[PDB]
Design a protein around this nucleic acid. Structure first.
Ligand SMILES: [Mg+2]
Ligand SMILES: [Mg+2]
Ligand SMILES: [Mg+2]
Ligand SMILES: [Mg+2]
Ligand SMILES: [Mg+2]
Ligand SMILES: [Mg+2]
Ligand SMILES: [Mg+2]
Ligand SMILES: [Mg+2]
Ligand SMILES: [Mg+2]
Ligand SMILES: [Mg+2]
Ligand SMILES: [Zn+2]
Ligand SMILES: [Zn+2]
Lengths: 129, 25, 82, 217, 206, 97, 129, 100, 87
RNA sequence: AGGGGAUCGAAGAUGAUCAGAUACCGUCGUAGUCUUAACCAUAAACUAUGCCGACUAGGGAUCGGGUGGUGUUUUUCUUAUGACCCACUCGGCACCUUACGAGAAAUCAAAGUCUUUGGGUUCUGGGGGGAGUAUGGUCGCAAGGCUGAAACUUAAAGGAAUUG
């Protein structure tokens, strides 16, 4: 089966961005996807993206910016206990300096810097660097 | 020696071993 | 199809070419052909892929032999589009 | 004893390329050797290992010597030459010469917070040569280079003050571990950041600008 | 941006169309590669002309952009272009290579025929290929006269063209030289068929 | 690829049972879990063993080198097992007696 | 087994390169011309050089040759490349009618151009290969 | 030992385990795929007749037929003489029918 | 990148490919600078003025350097009718 | 356990050869082979490539489905089927080039999207041997299978490629 759509989508992104396609298509297209992408937009790893409504399921067209390096997804959505964020981001992203860890939470879908300001953690989805 | 025969070798060795332990019920 | 395609607006050639499923929107490419039999002056809305030996409204004229894809319209018959 | 072939050779003799960045800026194919000595005076020049390496013959064998040479400074440029010549000295010579062609700069970063001059890597990089991954993996200040002796000496000549490594795979084959730690170094300017997001103008190269001064009459 | 002047003269189209530049490439058709305006039935592809000549100007614009002209190494191996390249050599003084390239001519700073281009021109990336694949080792563009069958690996500014050969090769070189001269040179006007001649290029009776 | 092993947020058991039952091919772990040290290994899983020199042997060594090694068959006290101990240094089985 | 050596063929190649003039077909002349210019130690070698030079001259009469195209041989094209036997007419004019163009080409001409000369062919696609 | 070939036995691809053919010379059972299936279209009469036969014969033009031995060879059997001919690593990629 | 208060550390601030935005490295022997001369009215190619376009080695070796340079030119006004939005 | 047994044909006889050779070859030729009713349950049962899932590159072909061509020919006048050509398409089976991607490499468009490490799942392996043995189950008419040890032993066993 097609399991984690988010992953299965971000995989296409990661393939697209690897070759230098200026865009990608993403079949299934969720809230999470869009709130994940929305996050990439707010930092700037991603251009426009255009959610098609198949009178049906979803479908997205992303515009890549040549800025994504990796559009990570961590797989069993591990629960994170606020301090353990530091151990995830340390182990996933290059450097204390720059990068983001896209985590769903009580607050919605933040990145790990926004989630530290708020003082609210939860599950992880993926990351970007 | 050739491994198929080294297999066949230890097949007889078992079938002799079966007669030995069967001689004491 | 390399690097930059602007994938929201394909050329209609591609849409017509690609699978009826494998486009931006799954739109079927079948129609409800309004067939007229030689007998009665009345028009049956024959779906082009019937799957059935399609009779008329009452008289047993037999309109369309259901083949695999589109049905072969039985004998010298006439039809409107959709 | 100079006399250059290659536009760029003549061009550096004229003194219109300053040193060195411009070469890298326009990825200029530095096939000649003299160039890098002229521009970079502080190239030292350290032989890692020298295996004997023998071809087998109708009778006996052919002992060549693959001398591995990390060339560098503490500025932020490093070289890696391997050369197999039958005489050993000549091999180190030709190794040093090759290492000064392959010479390559290193994005040196922080650690975390800028404060003082950078002397770790920016990011976690990796190399992969044969079956060695060198990963490294920027330190915090003063923690030291933490490395296989081979990787360390490469990272002394870089001027990376502090970095953790995860030299992984058969790191005992040194040619490869260096080639790995060379590529992981190469990767740096090559990995993007949000500090590059800001777009540049794309300058004209010295070749395009100083056309007349390059080439023969 | 543009002058809105160069829209291809009605005669020059007739010149291109005379050489069958757009009645070529055939069945075989690479997927890069949008220089088709329609395809004629059975063993034919029809090349979009406007796309060619905008690039023939673009190429020239780049060829002009190198200040030192004795530098743009044109190359040809496959015989039908050999003479045309040497004509392009004569008008715009830019050392080229007819026939055999010699590998290690852009690389390998010892060879007798060591060039060092700051632009390369090629007729058949099927054949001259080597020189193209070589040029990648030393950071040079590669203007090429690609048909819609040939590979454009390590190629920038691929002029669409018919490479059955014979006429179309020499014609398209001549239209380059033309627009390289018009873009900085003697000729100040797009008009006047002038002389020169297209037939100066072309393949000869051996 | 999924990479063999399970990845569920509720897998755990199919990890923790798998790693119990692969470990068993780790020869470090097997000796520790099965008490080869205690049940075998002449010394009782112990640094040392006092044992009475039953005889001074000369053991002709394996190949490349060639030397009779001057050893001692022992009888380990505690277990009553018999082993063969080497005697290091020039002669010194002379000192062993 | 008279195949002339490298030095023979190397010199004689470099001899005719620098001195196409001062080489009259016949041997004894070219022999004395060789001992003048190039500084041969031997007698036989010098005679053997002269022997190849001649064979190069005698080929030169029957057209040019590969590896032997220096200055005068370049010019002995070259005129012909410059002033070609062709062309009368243009050539590549609309000599017979006004171009037998195809339907697809006529349609292409109409899109880009406005009014050009045409002679619409039938476009017989044809059976078999 | 890695793969010499990608095909190996060749026809067999998408096809469990096909039937075999006894070879000609050795009578060595080989799959009808691994088989080296040469065609020997030989004349019924050898070239150095043929005149002699047609001289003594009744009729003109004649049947003069050709026997159609579709041979097979057990690769080994084939190598020992026949079309096989041990090619170079790079040359082994070529499927082109030889000569012609 | 920026130490203390600006003071831009780290030289070699790189050519980023015009097509991909991907970085062109110091040893991208494959990278390029296409320079294109500016046009003026009635002939004239304006000596010493270029619209520069770097290409990455990636797009160049694939073959996607062709159409990316078109689209690059097309957007930046050196062409018409060449690169299409849809295909 | 039945039926049949043509030829080959484990066993055997037997004719040569070689220092010898119950080994090829030679000649014959029960068991089988073939089949039917039971079992057995393993094979280089090998694509030595688990299954599903997505996405990355072109080339041309290749076939089983399906579209369009005032295309060509069939010719019984328009034909209409058929059969191609050409372009593109869902499904299948495999090649070419560069690899910028993988890979120890051979190679691989999957064995890619992996130290820039996380789509889902099942299984297997942890130096070589000892050993697929000992034992104990368990299954089998049995052969044997499945399951599966250590003590002891040893510095290599491999793999791929390079030159000889
Ligand atoms: Mg011995
Ligand atoms: Mg082997
Ligand atoms: Mg073998
Ligand atoms: Mg094996
Ligand atoms: Mg199948
Ligand atoms: Mg099978
Ligand atoms: Mg016998
Ligand atoms: Mg098995
Ligand atoms: Mg198996
Ligand atoms: Mg073991
Ligand atoms: Zn009715
Ligand atoms: Zn045989």
């Amino acid at each position: 089966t097609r399991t984690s759509v988010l992953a299965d989508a971000l995989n296409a992104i990661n393939n697209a961005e690897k070759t230098g396609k200026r865009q990608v298509l993403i079949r299934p297209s969720s809230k999470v996807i869009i709130k994940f992408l929305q996050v990439m937009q707010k930092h700037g790893y991603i251009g426009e993206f255009e959610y098609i409504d198949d009178h049906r399921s979803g479908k997205i067209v992303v515009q890549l910016n040549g800025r994504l390096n990796k559009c990570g997804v961590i797989s069993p959505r591990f629960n994170v206990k606020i301090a353990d964020v530091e151990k995830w981001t340390a182990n996933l992203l290059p450097a204390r300096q720059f990068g983001y860890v896209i985590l769903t939470t009580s607050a919605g879908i933040m990145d790990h810097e926004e989630a530290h300001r708020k003082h609210v953690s939860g599950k992880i989805l993926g990351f970007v660097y | 020696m050739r491994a198929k025969w080294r297999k066949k070798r230890t097949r007889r060795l078992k079938r002799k071993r079966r007669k030995v332990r069967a001689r004491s019920k | 199809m390399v690097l930059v395609q602007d994938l929201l607006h394909p050329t209609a050639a591609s849409e017509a070419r690609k699978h009826k499923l494998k486009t931006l929107v799954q739109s079927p490419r079948s129609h409800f052909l309004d067939v007229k039999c030689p007998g009665c002056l009345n028009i049956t809305t024959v779906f082009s892929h019937a799957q059935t030996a399609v009779t008329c409204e009452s008289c047993s004229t037999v309109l369309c032999t259901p083949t695999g894809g589109k049905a072969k319209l039985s004998e010298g018959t006439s039809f409107r589009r959709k | 004893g100079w006399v250059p072939v290659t536009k760029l050779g003549r061009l550096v003799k004229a003194g219109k390329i300053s040193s060195i960045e411009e070469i890298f800026l326009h990825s200029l194919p530095v096939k000649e050797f003299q160039i890098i000595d002229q521009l970079l005076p502080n190239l030292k020049d350290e032989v890692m290992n020298i295996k004997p390496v023998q071809k087998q013959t109708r009778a006996g064998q052919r002992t060549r010597f693959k001398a591995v040479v990390v060339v560098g400074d503490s500025n932020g440029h490093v070289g890696l030459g391997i050369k197999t010549a039958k005489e050993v000295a000549g091999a180190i010579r030709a190794g040093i010469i090759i290492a000064k062609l392959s010479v390559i700069p290193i994005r040196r970063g922080y650690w975390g917070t800028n404060l003082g001059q950078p002397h770790s890597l920016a990011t976690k990089t990796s190399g992969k040569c044969g079956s060695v991954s060198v990963r490294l993996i920027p330190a915090p200040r003063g923690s030291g280079i933490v490395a296989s002796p081979a990787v360390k000496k490469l990272m002394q000549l870089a001027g990376v003050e502090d970095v953790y490594t995860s030299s992984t795979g058969s790191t005992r084959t040194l040619e490869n571990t260096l080639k790995a730690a060379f590529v992981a170094i190469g990767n740096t300017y090559g990995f993007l950041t949000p500090n590059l997001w800001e777009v540049q103008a794309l300058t004209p190269s010295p070749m395009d600008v100083y056309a007349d001064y390059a080439t023969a009459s | 941006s543009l002058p809105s002047t160069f829209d291809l003269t009605s005669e020059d189209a007739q010149l291109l169309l005379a050489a069958r530049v757009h009645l070529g490439a055939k069945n075989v058709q690479v997927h890069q590669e949008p220089y088709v305006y329609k395809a004629r039935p059975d063993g034919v592809n029809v090349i979009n002309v406007g796309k060619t000549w905008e690039k023939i100007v673009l190429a020239a614009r780049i060829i002009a952009a190198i200040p030192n002209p004795e530098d743009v190494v044109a190359i040809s191996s496959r015989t039908y272009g050999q003479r045309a390249v040497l004509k392009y050599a004569a008008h715009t003084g830019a050392t080229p290579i007819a026939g055999r390239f010699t590998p290690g001519s852009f690389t390998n700073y010892i060879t007798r025929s060591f060039k060092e281009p700051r632009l390369v021109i090629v007729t058949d990336p099927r054949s001259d290929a080597q020189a193209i694949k070589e040029s990648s080792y030393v950071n040079i563009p590669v203007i090429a006269l690609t048909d819609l069958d040939s590979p454009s690996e390590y190629v920038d500014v691929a002029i669409p063209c018919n490479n059955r050969g014979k006429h179309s090769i020499g014609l398209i070189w001549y239209l380059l030289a033309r627009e390289v001269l018009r873009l900085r040179g003697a000729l100040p006007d797009r008009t006047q068929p002038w002389a020169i001649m297209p037939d100066l290029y072309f393949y000869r009776n051996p | 690829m999924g990479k063999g092993k399970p990845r569920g947020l509720n897998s755990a058991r199919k990890l923790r049972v798998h790693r119990r039952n692969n470990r068993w091919a780790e020869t470090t772990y097997k000796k520790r879990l099965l008490g080869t040290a205690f049940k075998s290994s002449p010394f009782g899983g112990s640094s040392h063993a006092k044992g009475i020199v039953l005889e001074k042997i000369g053991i002709e060594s394996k190949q490349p080198n060639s030397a009779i090694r001057k050893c001692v068959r022992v009888q380990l006290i505690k277990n009553g097992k018999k082993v063969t101990a080497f005697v290091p240094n020039d002669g010194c089985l002379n000192f062993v007696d | 087994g008279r195949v002339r050596t490298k030095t023979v063929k190397r010199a004689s190649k470099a001899l005719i390169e620098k001195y196409y003039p001062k080489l009259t077909m016949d041997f004894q002349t070219n022999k004395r011309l060789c001992d003048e210019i190039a500084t041969i130690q031997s007698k036989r070698l010098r005679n053997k050089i002269a022997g190849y030079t001649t064979h190069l001259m005698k080929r030169i009469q029957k057209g040019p040759v590969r590896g032997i195209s220096f200055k005068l041989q370049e010019e002995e094209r070259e005129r012909k490349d410059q002033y070609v036997p062709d062309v009368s007419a243009l050539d590549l004019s609309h000599s017979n009618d006004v171009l037998n163009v195809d339907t697809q080409t006529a349609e292409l001409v109409n899109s880009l151009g406005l009014k050009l000369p045409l002679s619409v062919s039938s476009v017989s696609a044809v059976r078999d290969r | 030992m890695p793969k010499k070939r990608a095909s190996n036995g060749r026809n067999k691809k998408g096809r469990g385990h096909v039937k075999p053919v006894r070879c000609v010379n050795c009578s060595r059972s080989v799959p009808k795929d691994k088989a080296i299936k040469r065609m020997a279209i030989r004349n019924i009469v050898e070239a150095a007749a043929i005149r002699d036969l047609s001289e003594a014969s009744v009729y003109a033009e004649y049947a003069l037929p050709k026997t159609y031995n579709k041979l097979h060879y057990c690769i080994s059997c084939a190598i020992h003489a026949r079309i096989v001919r041990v090619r170079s690593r790079t040359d082994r990629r070529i499927r082109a029918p030889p000569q012609r | 990148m920026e130490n203390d208060k600006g003071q831009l550390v780290e030289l070699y601030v790189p050519r980023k490919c015009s097509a991909t935005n991907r970085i062109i490295k110091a040893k991208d022997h494959s990278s390029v600078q296409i320079n294109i001369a500016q046009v003026d009215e009635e002939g004239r190619a304006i000596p010493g003025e270029y619209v520069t376009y770097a290409l990455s080695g990636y797009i160049r070796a694939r073959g996607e350097a062709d159409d990316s340079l078109n689209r690059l030119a097309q957007q930046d006004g050196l062409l018409k009718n060449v690169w299409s939005y849809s295909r």
